[PDB]
């Protein structure tokens with residue numbers, strides 16, 4: 001026997017582990033500043049499905065230690081989430097280099113790019129109109145549901161923005177990009193000490209001031225996401241500097257409604273941009289304002305309608 | 311930088327990992343033939359709970375390679391289950407020796423021992439009567455619910471018996487012991503080639519004959535569990551040899567009702583012991599026969615009543 005060598009050498013297998021050769025990579029779907037996203041195809045990673053289209057997130061070998069730490073923690077938080085409106089983790093490859101994070105493919109990429117492509121002028125226009133009021137309401141409901149779920153799990157996303165909302169083949173939007181996501185179970189807030197690049201244009205006054213992040217500051221970013229949707233992904237506060245935005249927002253400033261913004265959307269933004277974080281709605285309330293005019297499938301898949309929303 | 315060393319050395323942390331020093335062990339709750347079960351106490355393994363009473367499963371260093379393999383696979387299947395009527399995995403310790411599997415404490419141990427302790431004669435009698443009809447129906451419903459869940463997840467337990475049903479502080483019974491559990495997703499059965507000690511007294515005729523195991527053969531074992539409950543954990547087929555049991559059951563034999571067995575319990579056994587596996591009920595049907603006379607909390611916690619039972 002070599003049963004003494006066993007507990008030393010083979011450990012409890014990680015459920016999430018997929019064998020590297022099961023992954024075939026097709027093309028680049030995105031370059032971050034240190035993170036590649038590929039479209040790919042995977043053999044036998046979902047029970048019953050012989051092959052599964054997928055997105056594969058990696059970090060380049062130029063990744064800093066901090067970047068590797070963050071990707072590592074992004075990978076872990078994703079393991080805990082199961083929601084139709086949150087980008088699904090499907091597997092991890094940790095045996096060898098590079099480390100792959102395998103996720104459901106969101107075929108139309110991120111919302112920001114998607115919105116910009118729907119500008120009439122866009123060189124990459126897909127041949128359909130910009131979003132209808134209906135579609136914008138459906139988008140908002142999906143995003144808020146997904147955010148509602150994460151808040152029910154006691155995480156604050158901290159980086160909600162159209163660039164981090166992913167759009168599927170059927171046009172369903174889902175929250176992605178959990179690098180900045182923090183557990184808030186014990187205290188209901190996450191406080192950040194000083195230095196650390198986070199985009200000030202999506203941030204709540206209190207976060208700008210005290211580095212405090214709550215589900216209510218996610219609500220602030222949600223308003224900015226509504227704004228991107230109704231402006232087809234303009235730059236918020238164009239022609240002001242980050243520094244100028246910081247001051248303005250901390251003083252009570254916020255964005256204007258985009259031209260011809262629907263009154264319903266405008267109304268949600270006003271709620272999102274209440275200075276007092278206590279006064280902003282919850283994501284569950286957002287979904288509740290929208291629930292009567294959504295696709296019929298929404299109740300069958302949403303977090304809001306599920307039993308888990310106890 | 312040493313960012314090149316990182317992907318080599320630190321991997322995605324396993325969510326289930328608990329640090330060994332968080333575990334304090336109090337006393338032995340059971341010796342298997344190669345597996346210790348301890349009562350213990352764990353610091354900070356459930357969010358919100360400062361300390362958690364627990365059961366800790368290990369294997370001794372005398373464990374064979376096959377035994378270590380099995381414990382390893384028992385640990386993995388448990389990771390996938392979340393049901394009030396299935397013994398909950400809480401964590402694993404894989405850093406160092408020995409490997410610990412940390413589970414919810416089932417304070418009254420296993421049903422078999424529990425039943426025997428309720429015999430009036432028992433030296434270890436706790437000072438309460440044997441189980442009432444009501445309590446036996448509640449037990450049966452809990453076990454069938456738990457088995458219903460596992461079947462919904464496409465696993466066949468293969469070793470259901472009072473010795474593997476665990477009894478909690480509040481007297482709730484839950485399925486445990488997944489060493490023999492097999493995935494049946496693709497085919498709906500698991501076939502076993504020849505050698506491998508499995509107790510013939512809990513087994514279906516077709517399993518005895520063809521080494522085939524289905525949810526319907528789990529239903530067979532469920533009947534035997536009803537029998538143990540109504541006989542206060544007698545030996546099934548006492549005074550016959552395994553060999554004799556094999557032949558008898560394969561021929562159409564089964565157990566007699568125990569003395570003064572309730573007609574309701576008798577009725578379930580008859581269903582469980584239909585020779586044709588197609589003719590036996592499903593665990594969901596069992597729970598459905600029992601649902602109107604169960605504790606009020608049953609619908610709030612059961613698999614049967616949950617949305618997941620889609």
Ligand SMILES: Nc1ncnc2c1ncn2[C@@H]1O[C@H](COP(=O)(O)OP(=O)(O)CP(=O)(O)O)[C@@H](O)[C@H]1O
Nearest residue numbers: 029030032035037055103104105106109110177179
């Ligand atoms: N699951 C998925 N399916 C399809 N495309 C995806 C995808 N995840 C990301 N992408 C594409 O790649 C781009 C970058 O994605 P993501 O937001 O995950 O990268 P990132 O480099 O910003 C992560 P971080 O902010 O933690 O460094 C997205 O804007 C999107 O178009």
Ligand SMILES: Nc1ncnc2c1ncn2[C@@H]1O[C@H](COP(=O)(O)OP(=O)(O)CP(=O)(O)O)[C@@H](O)[C@H]1O
Nearest residue numbers: 339340342345347365413414415416419420487489
């Ligand atoms: N979660 C738990 N809480 C309390 N006691 C437990 C327990 N799990 C097991 N025990 C006690 O230890 C005994 C052995 O438990 P278990 O059925 O897991 O051991 P085993 O050695 O039979 C596993 P295997 O069949 O895979 O080798 C049980 O009959 C029970 O009394």
Ligand SMILES: [Mg+2]
Nearest residue numbers: 032033034035
């Ligand atoms: Mg990036």
Ligand SMILES: [Mg+2]
Nearest residue numbers: 032163164177
């Ligand atoms: Mg991003």
Ligand SMILES: [Mg+2]
Nearest residue numbers: 342343344345
């Ligand atoms: Mg044992």
Ligand SMILES: [Mg+2]
Nearest residue numbers: 342473474487
């Ligand atoms: Mg056992």
